[PDB]
Amino acid sequence: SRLAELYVERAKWLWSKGDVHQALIVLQKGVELCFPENETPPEGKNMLIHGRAMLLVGRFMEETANFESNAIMKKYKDVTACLPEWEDGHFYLAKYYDKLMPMVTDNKMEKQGDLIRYIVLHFGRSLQYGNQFIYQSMP
Amino acid sequence: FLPDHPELKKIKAVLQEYRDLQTTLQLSMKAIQHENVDVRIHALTSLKETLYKNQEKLIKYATDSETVEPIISQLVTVLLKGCQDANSQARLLCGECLGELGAIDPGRLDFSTTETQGKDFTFVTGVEDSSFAYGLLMELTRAYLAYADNSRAQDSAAYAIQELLSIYDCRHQLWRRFPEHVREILEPHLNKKPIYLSKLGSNFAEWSASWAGYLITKVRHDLASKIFTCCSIMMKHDFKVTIYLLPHILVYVLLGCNQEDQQEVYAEIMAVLKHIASDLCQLSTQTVFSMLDHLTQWARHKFQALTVDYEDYQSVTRFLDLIPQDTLAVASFRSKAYTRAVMHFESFITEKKQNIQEHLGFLQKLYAAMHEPDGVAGVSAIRKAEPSLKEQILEHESLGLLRDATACYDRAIQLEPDQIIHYHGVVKSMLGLGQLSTVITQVNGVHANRSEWTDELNTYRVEAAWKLSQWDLVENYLAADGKSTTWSVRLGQLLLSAKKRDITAFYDSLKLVRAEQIVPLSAASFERGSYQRGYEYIVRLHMLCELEHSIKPLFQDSLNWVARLEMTQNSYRAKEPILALRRALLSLNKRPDYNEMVGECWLQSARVARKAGHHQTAYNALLNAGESRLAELYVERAKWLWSKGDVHQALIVLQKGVELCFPTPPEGKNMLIHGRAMLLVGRFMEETANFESNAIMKKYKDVTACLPEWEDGHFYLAKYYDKLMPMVTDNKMEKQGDLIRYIVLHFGRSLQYGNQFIYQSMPRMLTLWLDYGTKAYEWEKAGRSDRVQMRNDLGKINKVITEHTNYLAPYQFLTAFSQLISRICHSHDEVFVVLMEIIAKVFLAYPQQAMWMMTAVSKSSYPMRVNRCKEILNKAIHMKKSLEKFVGDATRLTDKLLELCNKPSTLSMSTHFKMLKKLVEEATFSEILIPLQSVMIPTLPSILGTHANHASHEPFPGHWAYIAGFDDMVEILASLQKPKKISLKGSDGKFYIMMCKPKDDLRKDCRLMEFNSLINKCLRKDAESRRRELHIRTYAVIPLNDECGIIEWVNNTAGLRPILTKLYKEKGVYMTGKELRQCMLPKSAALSEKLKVFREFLLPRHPPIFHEWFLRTFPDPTSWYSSRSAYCRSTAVMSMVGYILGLGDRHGENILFDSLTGECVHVDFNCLFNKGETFEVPEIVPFRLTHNMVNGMGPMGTEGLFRRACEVTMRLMRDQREPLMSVLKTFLHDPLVEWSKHSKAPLVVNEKAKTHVLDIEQRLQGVIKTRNRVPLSIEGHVHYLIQEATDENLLCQMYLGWTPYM
Amino acid sequence: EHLGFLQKLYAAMHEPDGVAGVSAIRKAEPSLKEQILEHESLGLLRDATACYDRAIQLEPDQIIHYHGVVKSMLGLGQLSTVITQVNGVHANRSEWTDELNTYRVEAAWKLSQWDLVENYLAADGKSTTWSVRLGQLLLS
């Protein structure tokens, strides 16, 4: 595949390796493999793969000691954009939302809420998109 | 004149007119230098004998301190002057002597002092220069003189000799310039090219003769043409003369060029592109490049001036333009120019913008020539384009990861094979970690194929046979024999010779093996620091010398195989070779005990494997060897596996092994090993909540019981105790000292045995004791609980300290005791004051350490400290009448220093005050070595001897300078509160001006200096740091006054800001200081607006000149690459270490780069934890990264593989977390150091500084900390650090500071 | 005393978990062939390759011992490596050439080369050959 494809899977293998810096280098390489600046793919599966790479990047950001929450949200938005339908993009966004929700609360239940409502809507969309993350989303 | 004497009385008769083992060695070092090469060979034979005579004692001279022995340093000088002989035999004898010496760690070697490669430039414009005329005379001498002996050559030679005699008077200033002697007798006797190389030009000399006729016409000057005509007769007479003539002819061609000659120059480039004779043509192209460099030097002289010369420079530029640097790099790749080729490739990228991928394919070839540790893989990481599968296999080789993917390189060969050699590389992968079974299958596959590589595989099989130690394996070696042998295969042949029992005939074969080593040695000769690069090849030669000793035993100094391995610097690749050599030696021995020894050698290899990781490979190595089982040895193999993974699971297996080992009997080391296993269990206990800390303490007591004597067991127990004591308080504090005292007693026992690790731990333990004493004084003032009860614990601790002191060695305390003393002075005094008196006794032991302490005491009002100094002086008077007198002499020297500090182009302050000059003249003050950062550091106690290694070593060991006084007028650098620098003549007579600047504190710099180079000592120890082979510069400041700190100026120091100003001047681009003022930033600048304005101004302000600066720094293309490597050493991990501290923020003007190799320096980085950054503007990048500076370091790619390696080095520094923690605690601890910026405290502290120490621990963690919430990776952190320097916005946030457009 | 029966018992079980328990249970660590049985329970090819190499270094009297190293080559799954192992094996097994040839034939199935298939096809083995005999049917 011209797209990273199995090489993108190799970046997942790098995640299996567990070295974030190597994984980050792989993530940049994967974006490059679809294009130096790849557009979301016209093929739905290729676009979904690009979204999956964005989800992997969000996991990498969570691994990173320093990450931008807005940047993670933008990657999540891009994943949602590649497939509104795909369960994985919504599920990754829901996981990002939960981390965002603890920060939004800032240790206060009252502070959390508008963000929580957006997260709940994303969780419902993710459950509709796929049942595989749906059981976790339902709890 | 002095020579080794057969008869002692004849030497004695010479000796009385001329006027213990080390002195003999000093005579030997003079002996090693030889007036006559034949005389040197006799000396070399004597030197090899002297080393043998030294025997174990020579090893004892070699080992005594962790710091390399000075006597070894004379020996190290002997190695520099050792096997470098034009005669092969002379070099071989020197090499044999080096083998008896064995291989010093490159990190261990301290000889960076010698000027070595650096020298005043040889190049001169020529013809006007006497040396160019001397060079023509040198060309006339030797082969032209041999040509003069031939009659046909002689008529041309005589005409040239007569022309040379007409050109230059034989006399007598010219005669004084001339070597004369036999040459003077010769002087009296004297009184764009297709045709070139191809066809008639043939092997260079014919081409040169055709070129010379064109050149004489081409040169504008009649005199240059006349010189060319004289050269042309000489060029016909000698091919070597023609080559010398061609560089001069090229300079004449540069001075005047015909348009046809310019086409001929293009033709010569085409001939170089078209290019034995081809190697000579490649050498001729290199000579043409060298002539171009000489032309560039002439162009630089033209550039230095301010017309026609500029037009000539433009014509040279046009010739350079006609040449294509990328084509030259491709020719250079054929040339195997390597770093010189890389510089041409870098020039091509500079010359014309290129696709990064297009540059990358050439770069990948360049990386292979470089043999860089990153190699192709570092280039690949820089590359944005995914590697070709063959390129990826090359990248895997560049990684040299080995292990997994060795098969993958074979798999690419499986998909298609174009090279038998590529298959052979797969076969090397098949050998993997020395696997015999894989080799046997490979050998059968190799046999079915017919290839030169298949024969090489048979040679590899012979190496496997050497591992086998099998007579049948020797028969396979015989099958290899009668076929060309690789040098490793030749080593296998030497093993075959051991089976042969050839003896002296085998030794002659060994001499042939030595000759192959000599070819490596010819590769070894090079610019300074080449020896560290060639040290591994030298180690293979050292292994051959050990094999020769083994051969002598078979035919039948201490030469322990283990001792030789310890002396050698240790690297994971180096260890694997050393283990193979040790295995071979065990294999050669037929002893059953030798077979048990071979298993022990495999175990030693396993310890090397633990250093090399590759734990599965190491387990494979244990399987490959095994037998001679040791319960501790099996446990150690399990422990290395445990460290890689499942350490607790391995520990449970280790406990079962311990049960097998012990039902009793210590059994020597094995009982100590059982204690070590208990220490590993204690680490496991810390790891597991189920493991009980009190139980672990009981285990620690048991480990102490197994060996009372071992320092390590006590030290480990003390470290466990210290963690336990903090845990027992659980932040309770309050009562703590009695528990701390039990931990201190374990630390003291560990200190009494002594350890290299122990000395760092002991300083931390002493610091903890000092903190406890301060706490007790505070408690007594508080009245909290019982002041007396706290005092009683403190008194018991003081009594323990006195007992510890008797065990303690002042040399063993070394630098740490002095650093502790500035922190040590306290208002409470009393028992702490008594501890200070013990510190004073250590101060008495080294005068220089006391002198440094005195200067700090002088700056402080130190009314209590001066009284303590007076008590120390009374102790010094008790120690010697002279010791008290020396302190008075030191005080007088300090007063002279104070006058220099006041500093009321070059100013004659010494002329201005008679007393300061008189004091310098007076010998009454004790002679003082000029302060050095190295001089300040104490010589390390030897790792090999736990106790008294420091005592045998100088507590600090260096040649000691005696002040010669200072010149009456010394030029002083001018600045507000400017430091004034004057140089005292050295006992050596080298003089360095040292300048003390108001608003600069020498003591604060000294505390930074003391932390500095702790890593450098660690780097010499680290294999990776040795692979970097990069020194870390240490600033030295010795000014007693707090207000002014005086540091001798570094030679070749360049301000980064000053260099940038010079670069702007070289560009001729002009930016007004007022124009920079004209650019305006709102204090509340929009972050986007400020960055956008900054970027536009920056791009115009600083097109990068860094690459040009690097080219100026080294003339050689290879030399420039070495300077680039020095730049890679510069900043990088050292910049990262400052970033991890968070303290520095050095001004770009403050930063200094050495002129010869460019080395990064940080000056007056007062801010700690970015206190300065917090003030005013704050800069995100940990280390300033000017874009132009980054581009010059980058060459083709700004990002540095060496910089990535530096981040790994920083991770190694993180690995020594405890040493770093002790240093951080010390910086806060010293009274002279200010945690938060001594009349106030005759006997600073920052709450933020304590938080900063927690931040430093966070830096060791590598956790971002700044990011909200939040998982730390050192490699990711290094990438983040590169990103922080990279961002324009981070530059926008910074105000002033580097203030650099690029 | 029970362990010797147990090692046989573990083999009958053909269960890794039972084998792992036996290894923990034994007072003395398994070595050589006993270590090799432990390696099969461990399931790690690199350890197995080392174990096979160590066993070969002590002695090389077993075609099966060579076969276990070949199994490690199968774990490597590199066609060039598998061929290299096969060539070495054919010379080494003068008594039983091609005993691991069927293993090589499975490698040939991995090779997916008809000519590679032909060399295996030329070889004749009185064995079921497991999947590889099916591969021989695949070969035409």
Ligand SMILES: Nc1ncnc2c1ncn2[C@@H]1O[C@H](COP(=O)(O)OP(=O)(O)OP(O)(O)=S)[C@@H](O)[C@H]1O
């Ligand atoms: N080897 C050296 N030669 C000359 N000046 C030096 C050297 N090392 C440090 N300096 C400092 O250079 C200063 C002269 O001004 P610059 O070269 O612009 O640097 P600076 O920023 O003032 O340097 P500091 O004082 O070290 S922050 C003096 O204040 C010196 O302290």
